Amino acid sequence: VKIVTVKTKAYPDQKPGTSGLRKRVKVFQSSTNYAENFIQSIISTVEPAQRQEATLVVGGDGRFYMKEAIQLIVRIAAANGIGRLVIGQNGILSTPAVSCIIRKIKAIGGIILTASHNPGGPNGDFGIKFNISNGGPAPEAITDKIFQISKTIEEYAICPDLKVDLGVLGKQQFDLENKFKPFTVEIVDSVEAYATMLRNIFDFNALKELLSGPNRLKIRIDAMHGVVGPYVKKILCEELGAPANSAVNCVPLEDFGGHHPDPNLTYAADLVETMKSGEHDFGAAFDGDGDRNMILGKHGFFVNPSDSVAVIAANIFSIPYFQQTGVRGFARSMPTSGALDRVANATKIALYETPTGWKFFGNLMDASKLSLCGEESFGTGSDHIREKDGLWAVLAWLSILATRKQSVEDILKDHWHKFGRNFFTRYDYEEVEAEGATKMMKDLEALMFDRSFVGKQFSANDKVYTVEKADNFEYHDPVDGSVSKNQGLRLIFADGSRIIFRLSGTGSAGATIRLYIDSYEKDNAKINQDPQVMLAPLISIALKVSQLQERTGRTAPTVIT
């Protein structure tokens, strides 16, 4: 194989965010050398003397164009001095799977081809996420260095003629012009190391009795035609024994079967109606790269992502890994409910309120300060890998059903009687006109920081809402030193209820308003009722204090969660 150098011309817009460079498929296949430039810039943050001994892991959610880009990663990595590439079979590797192999085989990092829940196909989205040696996403110092290089890149090295086969397991070696050591491409099965990790974390024997034995928990798992389908089939059906019919949408399709792979009540509607009839006792959906999850009980009973991290924490010792490893810290992002705090306070185990996104979670985990973490945006994880893990949340849930022998609904009623209930909902007011929004935020801030704001009685219906605290949330990371300022506007009442305002403003399209309401109820009688009824007093207080119908003219939200 020949090593060629191609004189290219740099691109202005290749700024990789916390979730890698995400750009619609069209840009990648029509903008000459866009992919090449970004791949050669990623390879370039890796120091020459460290390249020959370096192994990079490669793989992605399976969406359209993933195979072309992998053949690009191989050719450039080869011509560039990279010794070895471990590619998942067929290029398929899930995001929690790639984190798992990087850590296992001590790889330099990995390149993951995924655009998460964002759709795929020719008129779909395409991303290139870079993960580093600890197995987690690259941190800002590395993402910006990729950025500066992609902006000033003049030329990139490639082996044009080289073409590995992705369906063949095993090792492939190639010889590169005059280079003394050969290039190794190793095709690994996609599920093996990941299931070997899960085997030592969970008690597969109890789960096999649950799913196969006379009692048989009749489950329903929808993998929405993304990367986790292979993993459901191999681990839950073949190894654990669940019927073949338990695994819905489990064949990775390039266009995700023309649908958004987003684990929520709106997009996993087919699973939600299927759960309503009553025949299944458990259901779950996952996103395109397998790191987010939706738990469903009997008849469609929605288990809220904030309640779920708290249920798993309240039973965490039912899982072999926690029994042997110990629980060294709990964590949630700030917009997520206070349910996890009610569980954490019942113990001498530390809780951390952090901004949105994994980096906050990751650093605590590397500092040996975090074992279980969750986000209200269908995200759950632990320190086994350095990314979130959808199927791990499902096996943790089946591990709690196995031990408990109660239905999902019963586990939650018990939970709310022990810990009280944190009613939670989330209103997504997608894209508004920036001036009104900034006004609403500055107004609110002013009003919130007053000498008479605090302690004051705000009210409606059965209870009284006394403002115990009110700020614009900022975080000082204990590990990398960064300070994330003005993360969200929040009103905190004395009973425990909260209202968080978060403005996702885009200097390209507009400004999205995310309204989060967390309302703590401790009464034995009010705990089991409907969330929108119990949350309406605090939602109208949020519209009456923010003056949303006023400054941005919006009446109802785009989405409710």
337 marked as part of a ligand binding site: no
- Contacts of residue 452, Cβ cutoff 8 Å, sequence gap at least 6: none
381, 400, 419 - which closes a domain: 400
289 annotated as a binding-site residue: yes
**Burial zone of 273 (CB within 10 Å; 0-12 exposed, 13-18 middle, 19+ buried):** exposed
* Three-state SS annotation for 112-155: EECCCCCCCCCCCEEEEEEEECCCCECCHHHHHHHHHHHHHCCE
Residue 31 labelled as part of a binding site = no
Report phi then psi at 75, rounded to 5. Answer: -55, -40
The answer to whether residue 558 sits within a structural domain is no
Q: Is 495 annotated as a binding residue?
A: no
Of 44, 43, 70, 45, whose CA–CA distance to 58 is shortest? 70
Name the percent of the chain in helix, strand, coil, to the closest 5.
35, 25, 40
Domain assignment of residue 560, yes or no: no
> What whole-number distance in Å separates Cα of residue 90 and Cα of residue 97?
14
Domain edge (last residue) among 400, 433, 463? 400
276 and 130 share one domain: no
Q: Do 371 and 501 sit in the same domain of this protein?
A: no
Rounded Cα gap, residues 293 and 305, in angstroms:
8
* Residues 6+ away with beta carbon under 8 Å from 193: 97, 100, 101, 104
List 99, 116, 371, 399, catalytic entry: 116
Q: Is 356 annotated as a binding residue?
A: yes
Residue 116 annotated among the catalytic residues of the structure: yes
Three-state DSSP class for 513? strand
Please indicate, yes or no, whether residues 189 and 205 belong to a single structural domain of this protein.
no
Do 41 and 113 belong to one domain? Answer: yes
Listed resolution, Å? 2.7
Is 292 annotated to bind ligand?
yes
Domain end among 148, 171, 197: 197
Is the same domain home to 191 and 43? yes
At a CB cut-off of 8 Å and minimum separation 6, what does 327 contact? 313, 316, 317, 349, 371, 372
* Solved using: X-ray
Please classify residue 304 by burial: count the beta carbons closer than 10 Å to its beta carbon, then call 0-12 exposed, 13-18 middle and 19+ buried: buried
C-alpha Rg value of the chain to the nearest Å: 24
**DSSP, res 238:** I
Closest to 470 measured CA to CA, from 488, 454, 485, 459:
454
74 Cβ contact list (under 8 Å, min separation 6): 58, 85, 87, 162, 164, 185
How far apart, in Å, are the Cα atoms of 469 and each of 189, 310, 489?
52, 24, 11
Q: Are residues 189 and 202 in the same domain?
A: no
CATH number at 379 reads 3.40.120.10
Instruction: Look at residues 243, 248, 233 and name the one whose alpha carbon lies nearest to residue 195.
Output: 233
Return the H-helix or E-strand segment holding 436: helix 434-448
Query: Where are the strands (E) in 486-526, listed by range?
Result: 489-493, 498-506, 510-521
Tell me the residue range of the domain where 349 lies.
Answer: 301-400
